Amino acid sequence: SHMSVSSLLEVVADDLLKLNNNLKSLVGGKRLRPALVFLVSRATAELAGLLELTTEHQRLAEIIEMIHTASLIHDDVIDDSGMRRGKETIHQLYGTRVAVLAGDFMFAQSSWFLANLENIEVIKLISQVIKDFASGEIKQASTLFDCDITLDDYLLKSYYKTASLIAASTRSAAIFSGVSTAICEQMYEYGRNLGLSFQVVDDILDFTQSAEQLGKPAGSDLAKGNLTAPVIFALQDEPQLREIIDSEFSETNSLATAIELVHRSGGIKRAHELAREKGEIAIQSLQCLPRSEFRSTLENMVKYNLERID
Amino acid sequence: MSVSSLLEVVADDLLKLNNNLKSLVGAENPVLVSAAEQIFGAGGKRLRPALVFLVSRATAELAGLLELTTEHQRLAEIIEMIHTASLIHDDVIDDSGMRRGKETIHQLYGTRVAVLAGDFMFAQSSWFLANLENIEVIKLISQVIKDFASGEIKQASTLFDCDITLDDYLLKSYYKTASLIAASTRSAAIFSGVSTAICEQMYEYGRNLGLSFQVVDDILDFTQSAEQLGKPAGSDLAKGNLTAPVIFALQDEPQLREIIDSEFSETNSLATAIELVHRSGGIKRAHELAREKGEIAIQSLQCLPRSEFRSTLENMVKYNLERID
C-alpha cells in the first residue's frame, strides 16, 4: 500500500525486532534505511551519554523511509506524453492520481515531521537530498544509451539516486545525538560509501542475473540503456560493445552479444573491486566509534552486502 | 481597478522578485529550467508575493525596522514558488491541458516529469526557507505543504459528491489556497518581530482574504466568458469539483444532483446544469459568502497603524470582490 499509516506501522514493527535482537547480543527493501538510522542512533547516543534514543532519533527513521518510499511511488508514475486522447483513461487504468497524491502526502508528512524536530541543519540536509533526487530523476531519460558516461558520473548519479539519502540519514542520526562535528562527518561518509557499495552491488546483480535467465533479458539495466559499473568498465575495452549499445540493440540477438562482451571484459570483476573499495571506506568510517554491538552490525552490513555477489 | 494601480506601492519589490524567480530553480537541469519558466512566465498576478511585501512593510514599520530584511524578500519568492509547485501538481491531478493560454508542464513533458518538477519546487522552497533560520516559519510552511496534499486527497475523494457541505468546501478551499496565504502573512509579521497578537491577526487577514479569493475564483468559473478564462465556463463543475455556487444551487435545484451524479453522461447536460446554477440564488449567495470573508479580513487589519500599506491590504479585499479577472 501507498499508506503513511501502514508504512509507519511496519517500520515500528521492524525496528522492535531489530532492537530486541541487538539487546540479546549486547557487547557480543523497506528495512535497510530505518535499520541504519537505528544503529547509528544507538552507537552515537551511547557516545553522547544518552540513556535512550530521543524522540528525534525515532522519528528520523520514519522520516527517511517515508522519503525513500515516496520517491519510488513518484518515480513509478507513467509518462503519458504525446497521447492526443485517452490520457484520463490510461491514468484511471494505472491509478495515476492515487500514486501522485499518496507520494505528495508522504513527502509532505515526512517534511512536516522533520520541521517539527526543529533541527535546521538536518532540514537543510534532507531538503537537498529531495531536490537532487527529483532533478536527477528528471534528467535520467536523457542519459539512457549514452556510452560517453564516465565512472565518476555514474557514481554521482548513484549518489543522488541512492547514497545521498543514506548518508544524510546517518549524519542526521549523529547530529540528533549531539556528538562532535568530526563524528557526524564520519557517519555521513559511512552512509555515503555504504550506499554506493549497495548500489554497485545491485547493479552487478542486475547484470549477472540478466545473463542467466532463460528468456530475453528485456527488463535489465543494460537492455533499457541504463549503463552501470560493469558495463562502463567494459566499454573501456570493447569497441563492439559501444557500437551495439548505440544501436539500442537493433540487430536480432545483439543484446545477448553485448551481455557476453561484458562478461568477457572482466568489468564485472572491476565492479566487484569498486563495490569492495567503497565498502572498506565505509568500514574505516566506523572506527571513530568505540566497540559496540552497534558498530559490529554496521560493519557487518557492508560485508553482508558484498557477500551478495560472492 | 487595475492590478498595477493596486500594487504600485510595492511595485519595486515585485520587479526585483520577478527578475530573480528564474534563477531560483537553478541553471543545470534544462528541462527543469524550461518547465519553471513555462509557469513563471505565463502571466500570474503575483498577488501572494505582493501580500508578503505589504504585510512585511506594515509590520516592519510598526516594529521600528529601518528597511525590509533579506528574509522578507526571500519569503516572498518562496511563497510564489510554493504556489507554483501546487499549480503544477493541481494540473496533473485535474488533467488540465492549459493554464493561461499555454500548455501545462505535464502536457509538454508527461505526468512523471511534471510530478518530479513539483517535487523539486516544494523541496527547493523548504530548503530556501530553512536557510532563513527561523524555525517557527519553517514549521508553519511545512504545515501548508501538507495541507495542500490533504486538500488534494479530499478533493479527489469527493468528486461529483453532492452531499458536500459548505463547511467542507471552505476547508478544501483553505487547504488549496488560504492556508498558504494565511501562513505567508503571518510569516511576514514574524520576520518583522511584531507581537504574537499582531502575528495572529495577520494570519487571520491572510486566511479570510484567501478564502474570499477562492470563492470569487469559483464564481468566475461560471460568470466569465470561455476564453476570458481559456477554459470553458463551468470547468470545475464538469470535472466534479463542486464549488460554493453549486453547493448553494443544490439547495433549490435538485435536478442538479441528478446531472452531477450522472457525471454529465448525456449531451448538453453540463449546459443544463450551468443554467440551473444561474437560475438559483447560487452565484449571488456565493458572492455574499466572499464579501463576508473579506469583511473579517479587513477587521484583522485594524491592529495595524494607518499606513499606505494597510490601505492597500484593505483595497485588496475590495479589488477581489469587484473582480472580473
Cα–Cα distance for residue pair A163/B234, rounded to 1 Å? 48
Nearest to A187 by CA among A18, A30, A48, A29: A48
Cell triple for residue A295?
558498530
Domain ranges of chain A: 4-309
Cα–Cα distance for residue pair A301/A283, rounded to 1 Å? 10
Cα–Cα distance for residue pair A1/A23, rounded to 1 Å? 31
Residues in A touching B175 (Cβ below 8 Å): none
Cα–Cα distance for residue pair B100/B89, rounded to 1 Å? 16
Cα–Cα distance for residue pair A226/A79, rounded to 1 Å? 17
**Chain B: closest CA distance from residue A49 (Å):** 27
B64: left (phi over 0), alpha (psi -120 to 50) or beta: left
Cα–Cα distance for residue pair A99/A279, rounded to 1 Å? 35
Q: What are phi and psi of B103, to 5 degrees?
A: -75, 150
Cα–Cα distance for residue pair B13/B68, rounded to 1 Å? 10
Contact B272, B259 (CB under 8 A): yes
Cα–Cα distance for residue pair B65/A21, rounded to 1 Å? 58
Give the three-class secondary structure for B225. Answer: coil
Contact A68, B98 (CB under 8 A): no
In sequence order, the 6+-apart residues with CB closer than 8 A to the CB of A27 are A292, A293
Give the three-class secondary structure for B158. Answer: coil
Render chain A in DSSP notation, one character per residue. Answer: ---HHHHHHHHHHHHHHHHHHHHHTTT---SHHHHHHHHHHHHHHHHHT-SS--HHHHHHHHHHHHHHHHHHHHHT----TT-SS-HHHHHHHHTHHHHHHHHHHHHHHHHHHHHTTT-HHHHHHHHHHHHHHHHHHHHGGGGTT-TT--HHHHHHHHIIIIIHHHHHHHHHHHHHHT--HHHHHHHHHHHHHHHHHHHHHHHHHHHHHHTT-SS--TTSHHHHT---HHHHHHHTT-HHHHHHHHTTT-STTHHHHHHHHHHHTTHHHHHHHHHHHHHHHHHHHGGGSPS-HHHHHHHHHHHHHHGGG-
Residues in A touching B85 (Cβ below 8 Å): none
Assess if CATH 1.10.600.10 describes domain B3-321.
yes
Q: B214 in contact with A at a CB cutoff of 8 Å? A: no
In sequence order, the 6+-apart residues with CB closer than 8 A to the CB of A15 are A34, A35, A38, A61
- CATH topology (fold) of A4-309: Farnesyl Diphosphate Synthase (1.10.600)
Side chain identity at A285, as an amino acid letter? S
Q: A120 in contact with B at a CB cutoff of 8 Å? A: yes
Query: Between chains, do B152 and A101 touch, taking CB under 8 Å as contact?
Result: yes
| Alpha-carbon distances, residue B314 vs B292, B298, B311 (angstroms) | 14, 6, 5
Among A101, A111, A135, whose Cβ lies nearest the Cβ of B153? A101
Question: Method of determination?
Answer: X-ray
Q: B167 in contact with A at a CB cutoff of 8 Å? A: no
State the best of B116, B128, B145 to mutate against chain A, taking most chain A CBs within 10 Å: B116
Cell triple for residue A123?
532540514
With 0-12 / 13-18 / 19 or more C-beta atoms within 10 angstroms meaning exposed / middle / buried, residue B168 is middle
Nearest to B193 by CA among B64, B67, B49, B306: B64
Residues in B touching A118 (Cβ below 8 Å): 135, 139
Residues in B touching A98 (Cβ below 8 Å): 156
Within 13 Å, how many C-alpha atoms sit on residue A55's CB side? 6
Angle at B109 between CA B107 and CA B112, to 5 degrees: 100
Cell triple for residue B148?
495542500
* Cα B177 → chain centroid: 4
Residue corresponding to grid cell 452531477: B260
Query: Between chains, do B111 and A96 touch, taking CB under 8 Å as contact?
Result: yes
Length of chain A (residues): 310
DSSP 8-state secondary structure symbol assigned to residue B178: I
Among chain B residues, the shortest Cα distance to A142 is held by B31
Query: Between chains, do A118 and B135 touch, taking CB under 8 Å as contact?
Result: yes
Provide the angle, in degrees to the nearest 10, between the axes of the packed helices B47-63 and B70-94: 150
Provide the angle, in degrees to the nearest 10, between the axes of the packed helices A151-158 and A181-210: 110
* Documented resolution in Å: 2.0
Nearest to A99 by CA among A127, A130, A78: A78
Q: B146 in contact with A at a CB cutoff of 8 Å? A: yes
Angle at A76 between CA A73 and CA A77, to 5 degrees: 95
Helix (H) or strand (E) holding B189: helix B179-192
Q: B26 in contact with A at a CB cutoff of 8 Å? A: yes
Cα–Cα distance for residue pair B316/B325, rounded to 1 Å? 13
Cell triple for residue B71?
528574509
Helix (H) or strand (E) holding B318: helix B308-321
Cα–Cα distance for residue pair A305/A310, rounded to 1 Å? 9
* Cα A260 → chain centroid: 27
Cell triple for residue B44?
500570474
Query: Between chains, do A104 and B139 touch, taking CB under 8 Å as contact?
Result: no
Give the three-class secondary structure for B296. Answer: helix
Among chain A residues, the shortest Cα distance to B141 is held by A112
Among B113, B115, B124, whose Cβ lies nearest the Cβ of A131? B124
With 0-12 / 13-18 / 19 or more C-beta atoms within 10 angstroms meaning exposed / middle / buried, residue A276 is middle
A225: left (phi over 0), alpha (psi -120 to 50) or beta: left
Residues in B touching A134 (Cβ below 8 Å): 116-117, 119-120, 123
Contact A63, A114 (CB under 8 A): yes
Helix (H) or strand (E) holding B34: helix B30-40
> In chain B, where do the E strands start and end?
98-99, 102-103
